[PDB]
Amino acid sequence: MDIAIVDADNPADAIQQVKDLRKYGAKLIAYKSKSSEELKLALKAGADIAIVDADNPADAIQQVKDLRKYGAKLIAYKSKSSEELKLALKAGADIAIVDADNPADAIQQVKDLRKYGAKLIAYKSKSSEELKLALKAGADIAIVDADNPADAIQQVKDLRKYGAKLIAYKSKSSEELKLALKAGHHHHHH
């Protein structure tokens, strides 16, 4: 199953991309912001996954509680700190996004969070080899980050071939989705 990550460079365009992805037939739509209020707007537009990215951990943990009370179906939390990710999960986050800079640290955090009881661990890399190591370590969601667009296609190909069940990547633009819809085309299941 694919997760489309909204990637527009401003909130108005990001909110429109949610609508375009939903119409195109994306099964899961993820939206990241440092603003709780912006994440509520993305959910109201039809996003499935609200990614908490606020810098201040006190503020970020309160956003999890606010989004849960609000009825967010899936709340993700992005941190370089496995201690912070544990606090986010205790506060009601569904998905811990491992963001640690050093790959050795990031893989140990996957193993730590699995043993802590994390239900859904996500891991991000430009490297197919690193995502396979993370999946083996117990990650549930593989986030493709390949720099240029041709690299991103190969990484998704690599993960499909591997049998990754939850593949996340940056979405096509609204203008691309709208052109496909104008032609009568929709997302096809893989």
Numbering used by the authors: 0 to 189
Structure paper excerpt:
Here, we investigate the capability of a deep neural network model to automate design of sequences onto protein backbones, having learned directly from crystal structure data and without any human-specified priors. To assess whether the model could perform sequence design for de novo structures, we tested our method on a Rosetta-generated four-fold symmetric de novo TIM-barrel backbone, a (βαβα)4 topology consisting of an eight-stranded barrel surrounded by eight alpha helices. We had the model fully redesign 50 four-fold symmetric sequences for the backbone and selected 8 designs for further characterization based on ranking by the model PLL and other metrics (see “Methods” section), using no information about previously confirmed sequences. Of these 8 designs, 4 are cooperatively folded proteins, as indicated by circular dichroism (CD) wavelength scans and by the presence of clear two-state transitions in thermal melt curves.
For F2C, the C-terminal helix is dislodged, although the complete barrel is formed. We hypothesize that the design of Ala3 (and symmetric positions Ala49, Ala95, Ala141) reduces the hydrophobic volume in the core, possibly allowing other interactions in the crystallization conditions to dislodge the helix (further discussion in Supplementary Note 1). For F2C, the model uses an isoleucine to wedge between the long and short helices and forming a Tyr-Glu-Ser polar network that extends to coordinate the loop from the beta-sheet to the short helix; for F15C, the model has a different solution, designing phenylalanine and valine residues (F10, V14) to pack the long helix against the shorter one near the top of the barrel. Particularly interesting are the Tyr-backbone contact and the His-Glu-backbone polar network for F2C and F15C, respectively, that help coordinate the helices across symmetric subunits at the base of the structure; these are the only hydrogen bonding solutions designed at this position among all previous structure-confirmed sequences for this scaffold.
